[PDB]
Design an enzyme around this catalytic site. Structure first.
Site, mmCIF file in Angstrom:
data_model
loop_
_atom_site.group_PDB
_atom_site.id
_atom_site.type_symbol
_atom_site.label_atom_id
_atom_site.label_comp_id
_atom_site.label_asym_id
_atom_site.label_seq_id
_atom_site.Cartn_x
_atom_site.Cartn_y
_atom_site.Cartn_z
ATOM 1 C CB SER A 49 -1.016 0.042 1.164
ATOM 2 O OG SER A 49 -1.981 -1.002 1.004
ATOM 3 C CE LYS A 52 -4.801 1.892 -0.473
ATOM 4 N NZ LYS A 52 -4.133 0.602 -0.348
ATOM 5 C CB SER A 96 -4.361 1.074 4.082
ATOM 6 O OG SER A 96 -3.401 0.770 3.101
ATOM 7 C CB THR A 187 1.297 1.196 6.930
ATOM 8 O OG1 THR A 187 -0.081 1.441 6.591
ATOM 9 C CG2 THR A 187 1.572 1.882 8.273
ATOM 10 C CD1 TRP A 189 2.120 -7.800 5.499
ATOM 11 C CD2 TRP A 189 1.139 -7.112 7.450
ATOM 12 N NE1 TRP A 189 2.127 -8.866 6.405
ATOM 13 C CE2 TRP A 189 1.574 -8.480 7.589
ATOM 14 C CE3 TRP A 189 0.524 -6.481 8.535
ATOM 15 C CZ2 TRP A 189 1.369 -9.202 8.767
ATOM 16 C CZ3 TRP A 189 0.363 -7.186 9.715
ATOM 17 C CH2 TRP A 189 0.748 -8.534 9.820
ATOM 18 N NE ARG A 229 2.686 -2.269 9.363
ATOM 19 C CZ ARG A 229 1.601 -2.117 8.619
ATOM 20 N NH1 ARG A 229 1.666 -2.270 7.282
ATOM 21 N NH2 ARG A 229 0.438 -1.758 9.189
#
Length: 243
Positions: A49, A52, A96, A187, A189, A229
């Site tokens: 992500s 984005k 997200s 972030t 993942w 994270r």
């Protein structure tokens, strides 16, 4: 140059989580590496992500959307209950919310997306044929050094996009503020590839205005909390006196 910084302490942070990670820090003068797996800094991974940020820049630049648009939830089940609502691009950044950004990617279309990713030179700049998932599963990959350079350019309004578009995307990325230090970032993942990869890429605007960019990249496992994270980033940035 790109050198290891001072950190027995940050190396130990990653070891204590029993996984391999790097934290890349870019100041106006230097790039330094920290963590327990410094070879990750120059290794390509799917961006997940973190992409984005670039999806939004491309979508806004090409007037496929705007910061006021309300994306409609058409009622389908979504991975998170938090996503099942109408929302703006900026809201979806913070959550997200992949469906919104998939809808945007389809508007952009494969051809414009590939043209823009090549123009920016992001990672290997390969998007393949599927416009709505190339950042999650490949073939697009990027190193942490390349992500920290990208986000440093965004922070300084140095990407080759409109100044207003870059400001608008920066304004979607505020994560936390501590004593007048503002921490921006995104972030990621990738849960569906092996090994799994986690990201947190962003920058700190210090109270006097100085910017210090970062890219955290680590091997994830499914038991880990998503907050891992952020926790490793914040602890490391404190250790380095960046916040």
């Amino acid at each position: 140059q790109i050198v290891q910084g001072h950190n027995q302490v940050i190396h130990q942070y990653f070891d204590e989580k029993n996984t391999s990670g790097v934290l890349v820090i870019q100041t106006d003068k230097k790039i330094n590496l920290y963590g327990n797996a410094l070879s990750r800094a120059n290794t390509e991974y799917v961006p997940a992500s973190t992409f984005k940020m670039l999806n939004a820049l491309i979508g806004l630049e090409n007037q496929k959307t705007d910061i006021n648009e309300i994306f409609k939830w058409k009622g389908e089940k979504r991975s998170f209950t938090a996503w099942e609502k109408d929302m703006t691009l900026g809201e979806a950044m913070k959550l997200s919310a992949v469906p919104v950004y998939q809808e945007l990617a389809r508007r952009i279309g494969l051809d414009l997306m590939q043209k823009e990713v090549k123009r920016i030179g992001f990672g290997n700049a390969e998007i393949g044929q599927q416009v709505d998932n190339f950042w999650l599963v490949g073939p697009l990959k990027v190193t942490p050094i390349q992500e920290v350079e990208f986000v440093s350019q965004l922070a300084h309004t140095q990407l080759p996009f409109s100044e207003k578009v870059q400001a608008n995307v920066k304004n979607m990325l505020l994560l936390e503020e501590s004593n007048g230090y503002k921490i921006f970032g995104k972030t990621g993942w990738a849960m569906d590839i092996k090994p799994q990869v986690g990201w947190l890429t962003g920058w700190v605007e210090q109270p006097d205005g100085k910017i210090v960019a970062f890219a955290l990249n680590m091997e994830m496992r499914s038991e880990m909390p998503a907050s891992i994270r952020n926790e490793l980033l914040m602890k490391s940035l404190k250790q380095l006196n960046i916040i």
